[PDB]
Design a protein around this ligand. Structure first.
Ligand code: NI
Length: 341
């Protein structure tokens, strides 16, 4: 059964609620982004209207085979009527095609559902500037002050400099980057651009990338592994055994691997600056874990909420334990008392 924090009161609408069967009273199912925990349940057999971005809709059609007739793509930053309710989709600064949704209720209440997001001050000059929001359904993934990590731009800087130095010292080094979902494409695209290479990958990942509307993508990626010095592999293969096996397959073209695992936050962020990060190394293989996040830091989250000044907050992440729920409620009250709303 569909949980309460996935229902929009006063509407026929749910958000990211495809794993509960036919939801009672639901006339339209919104999908914030194409990540498996959010789409869990969609297939070619689904027969109700799905509302989403153009990019999410490309992925539903090509990867999940959902039929065209049930896919409703909406433009961003544009007031749209859905089943007699005004809605707007806003860029969530998460993975490609990810959106936040503003719902203008018939009774005058305004709700923002962030989906998954990385809060940014640029959001303060979107269409959110123009009016009051009563209820916020908030991505609370990192809602605790211990969760710190650098900007995406600093992380990319580290990766580009690290790769370029390694391959200039040794023109026979291969670079490998892990992935298990869409998002974080900048990591492998930036490294391949500095090295003057396309990114090589499986047919299945190339297909996913071709759905994402990235400018000049045919110039940046390929399924010919032999012509590429930056390869993508599944995240589960980014370990000493998997990388050794991969290097065997390359037929003596290379004698060293430098590999990156983009993660979210890790406890090594409590101690080490991005500048100081070092790899794990065994023989001719080194692995860097790099903290490239597509979710808000605590500080980013707090700045957004204190600017928005919502009347009520409903968390959508870490909702399963009394300890988590109590912790999040304490921070929301601190934020409200400090800023005076
Ligand atoms: Ni996500």
């Amino acid at each position: 059964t569909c949980p309460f924090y996935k229902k929009i009161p006063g509407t026929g609408f749910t958000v990211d609620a495809f794993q509960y069967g036919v939801v009672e009273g639901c006339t339209a199912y919104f999908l914030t982004h194409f990540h498996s925990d959010h789409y869990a349940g969609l297939s070619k057999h689904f027969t109700f209207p799905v509302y989403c971005s153009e990019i999410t809709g490309n992925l539903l059609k090509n990867k999940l085979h959902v039929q065209e007739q049930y896919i409703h793509p909406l433009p961003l930053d544009t007031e749209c009527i859905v089943n007699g309710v005004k809605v707007v989709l806003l860029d969530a600064n998460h993975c490609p095609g990810a959106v936040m949704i503003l719902f203008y209720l018939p009774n005058g209440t305004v709700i923002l559902h962030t989906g998954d997001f990385r809060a940014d001050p640029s959001m303060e000059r979107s269409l959110l500037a123009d009016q009051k929001v009563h209820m916020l359904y908030l991505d609370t993934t990192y809602c605790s002050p211990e969760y710190t990590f650098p900007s995406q731009q600093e992380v990319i800087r580290f990766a580009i400099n690290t790769a370029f130095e390694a391959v200039t010292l040794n023109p026979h080094a291969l670079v490998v980057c892990g992935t298990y979902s869409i998002g974080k494409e900048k990591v492998f695209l930036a490294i391949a651009d500095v090295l003057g290479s396309k990114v090589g990958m499986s047919q299945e990942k190339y297909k996913t990338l071709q759905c994402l509307n990235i400018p000049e993508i045919n110039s940046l990626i390929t399924t010919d592994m032999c012509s590429s010095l930056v390869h993508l592999l599944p995240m589960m293969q980014i370990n000493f055994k998997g990388l050794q096996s991969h290097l065997k397959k390359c037929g003596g073209k290379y004698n060293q691997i430098l590999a990156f695992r983009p993660t979210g936050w890790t406890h090594s962020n409590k101690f080490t600056r991005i500048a100081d990060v070092i790899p794990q190394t065994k023989g001719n293989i080194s692995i860097y874990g790099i903290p490239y996040s597509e979710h808000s830091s605590y500080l980013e989250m707090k700045r957004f909420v204190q600017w928005l000044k919502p009347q009520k907050i409903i968390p959508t992440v870490n909702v399963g334990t009394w300890k988590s729920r109590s912790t999040m409620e304490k921070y929301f009250r601190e934020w409200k008392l400090e800023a005076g709303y």
